[PDB]
Amino acid sequence: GSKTIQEKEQELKNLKDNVELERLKNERHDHDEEAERKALEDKLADKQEHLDGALRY
Numbered sequence: 001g002s003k004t005i006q007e008k009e010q011e012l013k014n015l016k017d018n019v020e021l022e023r024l025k026n027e028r029h030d031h032d033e034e035a036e037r038k039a040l041e042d043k044l045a046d047k048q049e050h051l052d053g054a055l056r057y
Contacts, residue, residue, distance in 0.1 A: 002008075029035075048054050 049057060051057070
């Protein structure tokens, strides 16, 4: 069935992701180092050309 389109593309899109849902979910951790790494990525994301949606970049 995977051979046919079966509107699979319509069901799932690149824009949508389970990343947001994962962030919403709270989970206990024995460390905060992982959280720090995420902050770094966010900071980098904020700094961008933002030209035409920066789709090219």
